[PDB]
Amino acid sequence: KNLKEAVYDICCNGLSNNAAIIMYFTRSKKVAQIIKIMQKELMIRPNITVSEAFKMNHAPPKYYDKDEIKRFIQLQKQGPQELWDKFENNTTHDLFTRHSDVKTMIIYAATPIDFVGAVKTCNKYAKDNPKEIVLRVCSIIDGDNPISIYNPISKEFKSKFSTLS
Amino acid sequence: KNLKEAVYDICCNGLSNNAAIIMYFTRSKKVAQIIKIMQKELMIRPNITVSEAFKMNHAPPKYYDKDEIKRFIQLQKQGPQELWDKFENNTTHDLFTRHSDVKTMIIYAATPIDFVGAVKTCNKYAKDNPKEIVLRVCSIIDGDNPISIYNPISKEFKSKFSTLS
Numbered sequence: 001k002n003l004k005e006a007v008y009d010i011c012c013n014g015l016s017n018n019a020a021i022i023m024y025f026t027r028s029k030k031v032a033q034i035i036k037i038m039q040k041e042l043m044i045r046p047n048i049t050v051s052e053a054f055k056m057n058h059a060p061p062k063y064y065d066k067d068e069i070k071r072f073i074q075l076q077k078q079g080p081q082e083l084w085d086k087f088e089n090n091t092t093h094d095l096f097t098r099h100s101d102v103k104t105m106i107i108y109a110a111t112p113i114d115f116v117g118a119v120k121t122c123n124k125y126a127k128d129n130p131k132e133i134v135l136r137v138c139s140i141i142d143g144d145n146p147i148s149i150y151n152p153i154s155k156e157f158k159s160k161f162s163t164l165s
Numbered sequence: 166k167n168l169k170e171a172v173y174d175i176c177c178n179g180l181s182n183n184a185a186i187i188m189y190f191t192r193s194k195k196v197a198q199i200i201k202i203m204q205k206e207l208m209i210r211p212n213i214t215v216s217e218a219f220k221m222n223h224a225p226p227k228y229y230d231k232d233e234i235k236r237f238i239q240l241q242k243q244g245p246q247e248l249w250d251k252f253e254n255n256t257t258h259d260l261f262t263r264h265s266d267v268k269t270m271i272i273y274a275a276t277p278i279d280f281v282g283a284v285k286t287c288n289k290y291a292k293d294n295p296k297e298i299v300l301r302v303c304s305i306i307d308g309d310n311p312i313s314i315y316n317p318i319s320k321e322f323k324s325k326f327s328t329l330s
Contacts, residue, residue, distance in 0.1 A: 006306040008245035020303070024311060039222070046227035046258045051269065054219035058312045062211035064278055069325045072278050080173035081166075089282040093211045100312055104216060106269070113229055113237050117254040138185065138303045141171040146189055146221065146267055153226045160231045164238050 006137045007119050011112035014161035017154040018143030019115055021107035021122055024134040025053070031132055035105060038125055047110035048118055049147050054104055057097040110150035111157040171302040172284050176277035179326030182319040183308035184280055186272040186287050187301040190218075196297045200270065203290045212275035213283055214312050218268045225258045275315035276322040 010019045025031045035053045042050050064072075075083055107122065109115035119137065126135040145151055175184045190196050200218060207215050229237075240248045272287060274280035284302065291300035310316055 002307055004245045004249045008241070008248055011241060011248070022305060022308075043222065043224045043262050044257055045254065046224045046256060049221055049223035049265075051221040052219050054217050056214050056216040056271075056273075056311065057208065058214040058273075058315075059208055059211045061275065061315055061318045062279075063318055063321055064276060064325075066325055066329070068278065069322060070329050073326065073329050076173075076176070080170040083173050083176075083281065084169040084285070087281050087285060089210070089278060091211055092209055097208050097215075100214075102311060104271070104311070106221070106271075110226065111229060112241075113233070113254060116248065116252045120249070120252065136305045136308050138305050140187065140301050140303050141174075142167055143187075143301055143303075146269065147223045147265055150223075150226055153228055156228055157234065160229075160234045161238070164231075164235055 003119065003123060003135070003137070007116060010137060010139060011115060014112060014158045015154060016109050016112045016115040017145045017150065018140045019108070020138035020140060021119055022136045022138055023105045023107070023122060023126070025103040025105070026132045027101040028132050030129070031103065034125060034129060034132075035103070038105075038122070042107060042118060042121055045114060045117060047114040047150060047153060049108040049145075051106040056100050056102070056104060058100060059097060060093045060095050062091060062093070108146060110145055110153045113157075168284070168288060168300070168302065172281060175302060175304060176280060179277055179323045179330075180319070181274050181277045181280035182310040182315065183305050184274070185303040185305060186274075186284055187303050188270045188272075188287060188291065189299045189301075190268050190270075191297045192266040192268065193297055196294065197268075199290055199294060199298075203287065206286050207272060207283060210279060210282060212279040212315060212318060214273035214310075216271045218270050220268060221265050222262045223265060224262065225260045227256060227258065273311055275310055275318045278322075
């Protein structure tokens with residue numbers, strides 16, 4: 001239900017050039033082939049961009065103590081400009097990175113029409129494989145089409161969109 | 166300055182596990198070298214996940230017909246449920262998938278404290294190379310730490326942060 005509302009909110013303004021789909025895949029026998037067939041099914045439709053499946057690395061965890069959390073808070077109360085400028089963080093860990101099992105795939109769509117139809121397809125794989133797939137939507141603050149050739153398509157879609165209200 | 170305010174909004178409520186730093190860069194070998202320096206800086210910090218540099222593919226573009234856009238609007242207006250159930254798209258294209266040469270990287274950070282320090286690190290390399298690297302901040306609806314081991318660290322930070330607000 002949260003996915004339907006989220007996709008609705010993304011489409012509401014007629015623009016989807018700053019949205020994304022993120023999918024995380026656990027390690028599995030079928031996983032890489034799901035990715036292959038999804039990529040293919042997704043891109044029989046125009047305006048869709050799909051990434052390669054990719055890996056990630058991560059550092060060790062760290063818990064911040066109450067005093068550190070508080071001084072971040074005092075710095076927050078000074079607003080965006082002084083949050084950025086006065087932040088400093090010295091914490092080091094003396095260790096290597098861990099290589100994760102989980103694969104990730106990013107999808108984009110140039111217009112709301114493509115976006116709805118892409119999320120519905122992804123949700124279809126996410127439903128049929130519920131143990132191996134996490135599905136989320138992204139709003140990129142001040143984002144645009146990563147593939148710049150789509151820009152006239154989105155701007156034009158928004159144009160016609162706006163005159164219809 | 167847009168970046169400062171998006172960072173401030175993502176951290177406003179003591180949750181970064183629903184957030185991401187996204188960066189896009191050109192194929193330049195001189196650029197892949199600066200990315201690696203950046204990853205070295207990033208990984209010496211705790212609570213930071215950094216994906217590999219990854220590539221993307223995409224479909225042909227399509228301009229939607231002012232009349233097709235209308236029928237999508239009639240659905241939008243009936244709401245989040247009806248938009249999802251009723252939407253159909255049977256648009257195809259006669260071409261091949263194209264391979265972009267834009268690379269992409271995604272960075273995660275388990276707490277607002279780690280998120281701010283990672284945007285500040287990533288952003289130095291973006292301003293230093295504004296033609297070859299583009300830097301964004303993302304909000305993932307109902308997101309969690311992609312690496313599960315961080316969940317207790319995020320949940321602790323939030324507990325303390327809500328006590329200290």
